[PDB]
Amino acid sequence: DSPVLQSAYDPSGQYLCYVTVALDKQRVGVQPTQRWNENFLYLEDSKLKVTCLKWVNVAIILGMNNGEIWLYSVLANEVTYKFTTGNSYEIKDIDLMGNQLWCIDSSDAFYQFDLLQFKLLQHFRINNCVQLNKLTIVPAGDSVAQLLVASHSISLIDIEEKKVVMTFPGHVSPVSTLQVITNEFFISGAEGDRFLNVYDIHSGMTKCVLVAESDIKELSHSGQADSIAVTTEDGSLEIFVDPLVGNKSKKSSKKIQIVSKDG
Amino acid sequence: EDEEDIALEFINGEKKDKLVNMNSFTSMFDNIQNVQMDTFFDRVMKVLT
Amino acid sequence: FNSNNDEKLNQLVPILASKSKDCQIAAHTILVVFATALPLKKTIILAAMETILSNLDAKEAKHSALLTICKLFQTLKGQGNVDQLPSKIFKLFDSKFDTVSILTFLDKEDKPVCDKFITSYTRSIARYDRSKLNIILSLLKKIRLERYEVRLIITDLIYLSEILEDKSQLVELFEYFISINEDLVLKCLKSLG
Amino acid sequence: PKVVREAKKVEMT
Amino acid sequence: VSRNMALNGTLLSTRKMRPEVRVTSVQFSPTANAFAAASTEGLLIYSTNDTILFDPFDLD
Amino acid sequence: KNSKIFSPFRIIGNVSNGVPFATGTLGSTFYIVTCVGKTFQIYDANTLHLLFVSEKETPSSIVALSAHFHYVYAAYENKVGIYKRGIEEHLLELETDANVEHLCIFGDYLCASTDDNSIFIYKKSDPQDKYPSEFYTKLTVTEIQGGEIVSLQHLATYLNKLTVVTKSNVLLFNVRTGKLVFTSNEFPDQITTAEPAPVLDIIALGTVTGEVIMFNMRKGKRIRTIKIPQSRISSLSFRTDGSSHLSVGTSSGDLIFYDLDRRSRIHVLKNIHRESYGGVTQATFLNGQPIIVTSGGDNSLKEYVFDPSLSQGSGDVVVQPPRYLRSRGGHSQPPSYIAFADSQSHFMLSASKDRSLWSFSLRKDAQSQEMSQRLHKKSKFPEIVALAIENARIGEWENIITAHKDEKFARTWDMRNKRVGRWTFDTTDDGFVKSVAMSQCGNFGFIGSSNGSITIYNMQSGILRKKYKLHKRAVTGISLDGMNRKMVSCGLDGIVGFYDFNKSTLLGKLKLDAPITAMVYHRSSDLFALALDDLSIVVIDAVTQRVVRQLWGHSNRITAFDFSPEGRWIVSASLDSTIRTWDLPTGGCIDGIIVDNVATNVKFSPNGDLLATTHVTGNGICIWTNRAQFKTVSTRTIDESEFARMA
Amino acid sequence: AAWIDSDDEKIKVPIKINGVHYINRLRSQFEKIYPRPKWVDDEGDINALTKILSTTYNYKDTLSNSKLLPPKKLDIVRLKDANASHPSHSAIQSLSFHPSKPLLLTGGYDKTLRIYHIDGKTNHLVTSLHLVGSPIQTCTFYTSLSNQNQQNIFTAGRRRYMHSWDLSLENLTHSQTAKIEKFSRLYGHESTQRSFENFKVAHLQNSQTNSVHGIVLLQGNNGWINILHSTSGLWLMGCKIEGVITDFCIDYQPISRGKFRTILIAVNAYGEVWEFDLNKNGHVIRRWKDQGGVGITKIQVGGGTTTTCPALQISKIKQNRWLAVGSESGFVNLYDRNTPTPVAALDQLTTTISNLQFSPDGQILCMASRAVKDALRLVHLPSCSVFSNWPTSGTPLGKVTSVAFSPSGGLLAVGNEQGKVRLWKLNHY
RNA sequence: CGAAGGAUUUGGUGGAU
């Protein structure tokens, strides 16, 4: 196991925000990837834990197990504002598109928030969603018209209709990553799995299944399906080159490892 | 001043009290006959104190 | 016998109304022993007084009740431990125990530890009774109240000066706190204004 | 001897 | 050999005495396809004649 | 979607899905009907022994169950089926798309409430008719009249009156005339449960904020108010044994009992059902007994009984606490692994994400039991990822081995004793266990480490004996022939290891194009199949150490696969939600299926007549019948394009 | 009757009977099937206590709100071992948490200073330092009270020299080398000192200049306590007692804003207790005896600032209210600092006491003995009564030889002769 | 050896026999 419970690069990839446990308390810190800062936000409650971590374009949104969302400005090193949901259920996932902010609780309740207005816009429940371990907002224009959600399978829901639109057979294990690589092409990954399913949104057919040498922890995509970088649970980084161009199952082309001089 | 200092003052303020064990009220039955029960309550307080 | 088994004590909780004096003081003993054995909610404690003070008519019952009353708050060990009594109970308490009776209660050298109850009583006086502020001064001299009990008593009197008109008994109370632990008075004033 | 509390067989009526 | 609950072993002058399950004798058939076991109920015969199993040899 | 080789018949291991269960009496035998997804199950209250099941699965999940003598009413989507002894006799179809929500049958009337606050009324065509079939009229309650309908209830001594209870308040409708006759006063709190009291004109009502309201409808006023702060009522039921008692279910899983005469609490049962699964979904006193049945969404049905008072006098004062008497349960989460216990095919072992190991009986008895985890001396363990069983040495020492998630050691399980064994097996290479296997003789256990090491222990003494270090990546499969001579291993590194177990030497090494995921070894035929990462199944014969058959067609990773007991067929399941039957002699797919839920595990029975499969959803096990065991089956290769079009 | 039907009265149901009468017959029959019960018929105050018992079935006051831990039930949970990431090869002779950062320092006869990042789930090792030929009988962190940027580790063993390891700036982690210094000059008092193995670190305020700096205390051959400057190492003053020095403990008495005095408490085997004023050249200011003391082995203070609960600036300096005195017999006399008479005479342990340490708040006393395995109990203060639920016979402690409380979070570390540091967390904190 | 004890007896219910 790694001391870093959660981490996430900024969109530019120049700054990394990570959360680690100091004694019984979690602390959140930020470091500059391109090149030390000794300032960490301290959670005063041992019970309080960081469930979600999301950068904003210089604030970072943190999902709490308490059932509320904190907005953190790293420069001031203080929580500027806390968005509190009515329920106390822990937030499972968080995503953003400008002012739009969508989160999901352990009750599988969708919520909508506005950064500019600091208000809870709408909250709703959609049937056939028994768990929601992942939330991702489709990048359609400048507004949200559909949402990709996955706990064991993957489902597509329309905000206006408040109903599911399409369903994709997902992994047996809980889904860990649901990043959208390009239009009508989003990658999926599950905990303790070496396989990534590339699904077509419009059609729903598995275009490709990318295979890692070991269980995949994190996923990073370059450009528009140009490449995908996946961190393996064994500590190695695998790179897939043009995975969207036998054809069903592809393996990583380049493998990167870190080892000390001693060995 | 700080709040945690006030909390530590509260903790400092708390004082011990004589805890009750199984063998603290056994002797009462020995001297329960022909006793004014006001004195019985007084003895209960005395042992409790 | 069941002190160790906290679960069994809880089931013993569900398991005074009689006009007979002997029956009321019998209930007093049961409440006193159990409270030290197992801590209870202040609502239980406050509700207990309302029963004790409802039919408190015999003198010997009053004496045993007052000893019981003081004990219960000493068992209380939570926030609001020394907060003011609520209005209905305080009116009930003073009616069945005049101020002079309590002043005599504090007079005796063998008084049981009651500073938790006394401090909670003092804040009740300031909140509800402006005439008895002088009795607070006499009350404080008789019993030495522990530090944080003093701090809260300084805390509420500060609001009195801002709200209540300046009075001799009001400043004399402050003058008393100027006499004892002058530095602590500044701390209360520093934190509050 | 402590109070015997037998889990007597219960058949429905 | 048998699954009859009546048979004793499947699961002062009077002998508490009932039939028991037992195999008196056994031999292979010279055809090398079956073997018969003498028992209380009678001569049981077990054979491989069905040969519904798939047992390929040197297959590619 | 239809298999020419397999056909479903029943699911194993599920007692209740969370829908409230109904109760009824057949003569002197009382029965409980419980919903199981798209089917139901009737149990005898005297012994809880299964009696009958639905002949066919409903196309939609059952929402409400009602029982009346020989007939049980099940509602699903917009149509209500009348069932007798588990058979379909007459189906009721509503004229609106709105699905049914609640059911009430009194006298010759059947009342059905839909989501749109519409109540449908039916009458028996004949007074002596066994069940209501004719449609009388439709009554709809508007928002002004009241809120959404909480339930449909009928109080005793009411001629042709339906006591509809809504979220806002209670409403009375005369179904014969179809008119609102009485409207109850508005209640401050949200109503959640309603139950008719035995006494006349009083109905118990449960709110969301721990309030029980005993509304006398004749006088139209509150009678009593029991307060349960910080709770919501889930079920209500009164004791009809001549003793005035009341039962409160709550989402927290606590069952409370009040004595209305004395206005006191008798006893409280905590956590009888899990809160996360809805706690006490339903709890009912059996008519005229001290018997109270309880159920929940955790796939468990329990019963509690009130013994006679131990005091010769003041028996009401001295009330014995409710006592556990009998119950069933099953997995509270979908099973992760399955295996057939014995050759006879009477018992099956099951492991789930709930960290619990169960043994499910296959026969009508439906007996089900937990594997006791109490350790031997010389919380639940983490979920299993691999398991092997063997039966030669049952009753002498441990005969089961298991590998736990994120666990460096394997635990043993004794089938005869139904308790944990006294042996634990370590990988000894700082690696997690990824494969577990046992020899046919039952003396040896094989453990595969994530670091590529294979450790061989002894089952009876639990002592390390042999260690083979060939694989450099995780070992995903181990198998030994019946002769205990040649052992086979596979690893994620893409190689297949061949050993002489007797002499401890290399017979050979074979490298495959794609990494291997799993292994299954057929001892009789001496063939073993491999699930490769390239979405292919590779069959290899140990004797000649060459690839024998390669199978293609799966569109995604292969979740599970197995050999037929005859060694002639392999059936596999993959993440593309398909089950394909492959005929090894011709090396082609002969049948294909499409499952709504991906089949996680697939296992043949020892006899071959039966096939057990587990899916991603559902707390039961889907068991299939092998039709080739009753007739011949063609081996013509299935059309791939048509099968893809079907998917 | 709130409601009346019109249909029932009009309709005539054949046996022909009118509804309302027919309804009455139905009411009678059901009344025959079940008797009418008596509860339906039924429809400051003295009944307050009766009502409140009915409202709730939970009667134990919630401990989450209470700031004082319960007297008799301790909510303690075990976490991952601290040494698991990098095991030691000898006994854990001493333990010490960093005053602010989440680090746990270990030492022993391995001659290795292993510092771990205590998180409770991984417990990885930050760095290590081997001191060739220098056994470690005791090690401790030190943070200057004035310059918060000054960190330092002081270590000593059965040797006539002491090692100091500077951790200021980036020396702890980034530096490829360790800045260490050897204190080996006693300035003419070498006869009094044979070894540095027993030492402690405290703060001394030079009153005339108001400057505050660290001091290093040592145990001498003949009742001698030698005091050295923490950084410069110069010999400041020496204190003498009579009989063989057994142990000494340190107390702070604040005087005014920014002013405090450092009192040194030393005890003899007799229980004779000396108190030196280190702000006045170490002159005795009080003398007393341990009531019924004999074979004394350890002395400790807490409830305020101390080596286990150091302060981060002058204003956090607080006076300890508790004082414990161990013994070979296993008695632990307790004194309330607020001849003295002990408040209690704890006697649960039956072997020689070796470790007495209070919680940072002074609410718990942990006594342990190295003589026998699992020799450890926790006493609730001021109740002076031992906790019962923990430890149990199944609790792995071994030959307890080191104990430490984290400054915050209520974490407990207990090392044993086998080199394992086991970690527990107090739920109240 | 050892995460909030160990060992012995015993009532009843459930499944087999």
Side-chain angles (χ1 to χ4, degrees), chain F residues 365 367 369 377:
Chain F
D365 64 329
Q367 291 300 292
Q369 202 191 326
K377 180 271 184 205

Side-chain angles (χ1 to χ4, degrees), chain F residues 359-428:
Chain F
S359 296
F360 293 165
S361 66
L362 181 163
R363 303 271 307 295
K364 66 182 181 181
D365 64 329
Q367 291 300 292
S368 181
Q369 202 191 326
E370 293 179 353
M371 262 305 308
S372 172
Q373 303 200 10
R374 183 158 66 74
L375 76 173
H376 189 274
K377 180 271 184 205
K378 299 261 198 186
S379 52
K380 305 222 192 302
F381 312 137
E383 52 160 330
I384 308 174
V385 65
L387 187 153
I389 190 166
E390 197 271 322
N391 64 7
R393 299 281 175 262
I394 186 167
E396 271 295 10
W397 65 79
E398 280 71 7
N399 56 3
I400 308 167
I401 192 66
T402 65
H404 288 326
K405 281 272 262 174
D406 204 358
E407 196 153 335
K408 174 167 168 59
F409 61 89
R411 264 186 260 274
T412 57
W413 291 124
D414 189 358
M415 202 56 258
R416 184 63 56 82
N417 287 325
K418 295 182 181 180
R419 177 180 171 182
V420 65
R422 74 277 191 188
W423 305 126
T424 288
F425 294 140
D426 296 332
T427 57
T428 77

Side-chain angles (χ1 to χ4, degrees), chain G residues 74 84 121 130 151 192 201 226 230 252 257 273 306 371 406 420:
Chain G
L74 188 70
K121 284 142 181 73
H130 197 229
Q151 282 73 63
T192 71
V201 188
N226 290 315
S230 58
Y252 299 96
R257 178 164 295 292
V273 176
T306 187
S406 65
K420 316 292 151 282

Side-chain angles (χ1 to χ4, degrees), chain F residues 439-478:
Chain F
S439 52
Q440 183 293 339
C441 61
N443 271 306
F444 287 78
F446 309 85
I447 296 92
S449 66
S450 52
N451 288 320
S453 67
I454 306 90
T455 59
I456 299 91
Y457 290 73
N458 189 316
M459 281 275 128
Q460 174 213 10
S461 49
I463 192 66
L464 63 91
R465 298 289 178 88
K466 309 305 153 214
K467 180 171 180 179
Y468 296 140
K469 181 63 176 64
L470 189 151
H471 296 250
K472 303 184 180 206
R473 297 249 280 284
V475 174
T476 59
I478 303 168

